[PDB]
Amino acid sequence: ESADLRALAKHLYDSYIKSFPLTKAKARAILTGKTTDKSPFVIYDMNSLMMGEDKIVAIRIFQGCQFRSVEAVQEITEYAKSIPGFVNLDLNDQVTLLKYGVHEIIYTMLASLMNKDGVLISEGQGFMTREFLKSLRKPFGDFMEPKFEFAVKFNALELDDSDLAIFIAVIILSGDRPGLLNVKPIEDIQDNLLQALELQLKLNHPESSQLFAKLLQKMTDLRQIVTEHVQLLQVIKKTETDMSLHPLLQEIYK
Amino acid sequence: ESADLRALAKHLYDSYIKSFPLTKAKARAILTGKTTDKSPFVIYDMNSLMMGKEVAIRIFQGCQFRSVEAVQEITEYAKSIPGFVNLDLNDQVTLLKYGVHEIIYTMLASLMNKDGVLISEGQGFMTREFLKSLKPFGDFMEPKFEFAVKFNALELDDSDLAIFIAVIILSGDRPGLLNVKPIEDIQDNLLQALELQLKLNHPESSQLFAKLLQKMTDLRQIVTEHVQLLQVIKKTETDMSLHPLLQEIY
Ligand SMILES: CC1(C)CC[C@]2(C(=O)O)[C@H](O)C[C@]3(C)C(=CC[C@@H]4[C@@]5(C)CC[C@H](O)[C@@](C)(CO)[C@@H]5CC[C@]43C)[C@@H]2C1
């Protein structure tokens, strides 16, 4: 029944709101001209960066990004438990689903905080220029550019948070993940999520032909962001042996 | 209108049949569904191979020969896809150039099971195990088998694969495209036709459309990882003025 799919949509949307403090809706309200009830401070060069510390180098911008990632992971983890059936899966598979799904999700949601020109930071208080990031030294000025390229095409799908809630759930419950003990219960859950997403996209974007297929295709764009990111980390780990990574993040990488 | 989608679906199936000699229906018959009338010669070891200038290289090289054949058959097929020839010529070239690898692994799944791949005409069969028994070359075919095993579990037939292949060609995110709009316009139409096809041809296979699209992510990095050992091979085969005309064809 349609009815059951809508109810799952609603449930997932409700949990999404509860798990993620900075929604796409809030982020698009900050980025635009809109509703300057609170506009961001902007980082476009290094001494506006010094001014930034005051009302809100290549290393700490990275270490800072590392922080928002580990906190993002803990948030995605909270959301996953809300996915029906998820906590009932074998514990090893829960861990495995989180290991591989977490970065694909981080870059899906990061797009919400991005436009062509830059990215919101510190829960929206801040905004860091794409150009400033691209100008960073040696192995760091490279990190954010492919995320920006993805975000610009992903953002043109014009998804809202209730669409994203279901898409994110679909991503966590893959089944094609390396080392899954128990693939069939995982796929039963995903088929359910896919039915739900499909209905949601059709109802929320009736004029948008084949948005479902176009959104699913976007998943290969995510895969290769992760891939580039991972190998880039391996470089930095060698050029700066004094710089430390976060164990939680480290455990995620294999 | 469901009529035009169905019309499009039949068109591609017909075109697919004329462009590709060895169909999936045919290859399945020959394979382990055993059609036992003319058994294919089997290659399981070095001496059955010989019974078929350096073994491991020359297998990988024979692998290039048929892919070059495949490219031309795919090229012909693409030209039958409604709207394709009306596209900008550079865009047509671009679409084939970036799509042809994904199509090749896709169709190659049709010639594969968990134990090996139909070789040549289908008059041959090379065991998976003889293939992993190799140099740097032992890891060439294994990721294709792994993909094929999952892909084949979807139990698509030729009528399904016909539209799927068309969707792959008309992507729209290929680098260097000049006019993305008519390409996506066509792929949208192809995606609708594929959806209808799967619902009629597999009415009890839930969310098969989505799962098939999910496979495209598997194809792309299969391709991406393949180009990465495609050319550890230039770390291997290097200097000799014997193939420069042959070097050219590939
Ligand atoms: C044994 C040898 C030398 C001649 C016969 C045979 C065969 O299987 O029919 C053909 O040349 C086909 C390919 C190339 C062959 C083996 C695997 C390749 C292979 C699967 C090798 C991997 C390549 O990436 C692709 C997929 C082409 O991209 C090709 C497609 C064509 C076939 C099936 C065979 C090579």
Residue with tokens 């039963």: A188
Q: Are B217 and A223 in contact (CB under 8 A)?
A: yes
A229 in a known ligand binding site? yes
Separation CA A233–CA B171 (nearest Å): 31
CA distances from A9 to A134, A219, B223 (A): 38, 20, 35
Which residue out of B63, B73, B112 has the highest number of ligand 1 atoms within 8 Å of its CB and is therefore the one to mutate?
B63
Are the C-beta atoms of B12 and B162 separated by less than 8 Å?
A: yes
C-beta B66 within 6 A of ligand 1: yes
Ligand 1 pocket member B27 (CB < 6 A): no
Residue whose C-alpha is closest to residue A164's, from A16, A11, A26 = A16
Tokens of A205: 């974007």
> Which positions in chain B touch A194 (Cβ < 8 Å)?
207, 210
Q: How far, in Å, CA of B16 to CA of B79, rounded?
A: 11
Contact predicate A180/A94, CB 8 Å: no
CATH entry, A1-254, from 3.40.50.300, 1.25.40.10, 1.10.620.20, 1.10.565.10: 1.10.565.10
Cβ separation of A223 and B217 shorter than 8 Å?
A: yes
Ligand 1 atom 19 nearest Cα:
B63
**A130 known ligand binder:** no
Ligand 1 lined by B105 (C-beta under 6 Å): yes
Q: Which residues contact A119 (CB under 8 A, 6 or more apart)?
A: A110, A113, A127, A128, A130, A133, A144, A148
Question: What distance in Å separates the CA atoms of residue A179 and residue B244, rounded to the nearest whole number?
Answer: 45
Q: What is the DSSP letter of B200?
A: H
SS3 call for A33: coil
Helix (H) or strand (E) segment spanning residue B118: strand B116-119
Q: Using alpha carbons, select from B221, B27, B201 the residue that is nearest to residue B124.
A: B27
For ligand 1, atom 32, the nearest C-alpha belongs to: B63
Nearest to B221 among A153, A209, A224 (CB): A224
A33 is written with which tokens? Answer: 């001209």
* Contact of B161 with B153, CB cutoff 8 Å: no
d(C-alpha A199, C-alpha B97), whole Å: 35
Q: CA A40, CA B29: separation in Å to the nearest integer?
A: 65
Smallest CA separation from ligand 1 atom 13, residue: B63
Nearest partner of B146 among B215, B94, B66, B247, judged by Cα: B215
Q: Kindly state if the Cβ of B148 falls inside 6 Å of ligand 1.
A: no
C-alpha span between A74 and A59 (Å, rounded): 23
Half-sphere exposure of residue A103: CA atoms within 13 angstroms, side-chain side: 24
Q: Is residue A212 within 8 Å of A198, Cβ to Cβ?
A: yes
Left (φ > 0), alpha (ψ -120 to 50) or beta: where does A129 sit? beta
Q: Report the distance separating Cα A156 and Cα A246, nearest Å.
A: 33
Pick the atom of ligand 1 nearest to B59's CA.
3
Whether the CB-CB separation of B44 and B105 falls below 8 Å is answered with no
Strand duo A126-129 + A41-43: pairing = parallel
Residue with CA at minimum distance from ligand 1 atom 28: B67
Question: Which numeric CATH code is attached to B1-250?
Answer: 1.10.565.10
What distance in Å separates the CA atoms of residue B221 and residue A141, rounded to the nearest whole number?
A: 25
Measured distance CA(B250)–CA(B234) in Å, rounded? 13
Q: Is the CB of B62 under 6 A from ligand 1?
A: yes
From CA A177, how far away is CA A102, in angstroms rounded?
A: 12
Choose which residue among B42, B44, B66, B227 to substitute to test ligand 1 binding: the one with the highest number of ligand atoms within 8 A of its C-beta.
B66
Distance CA A77, CA B221 (A): 27
**Resolution of the experimental model in angstroms, please?**
2.2
> Domain-by-domain residue ranges, chain B?
1-250
> Interface of chain A against chain B, CB under 8 Å?
153, 176, 191, 194-195, 198, 209-210, 212-213, 216-217, 219-220, 223-224, 227
How distant is the alpha carbon of residue A39 from its chain centre? 23
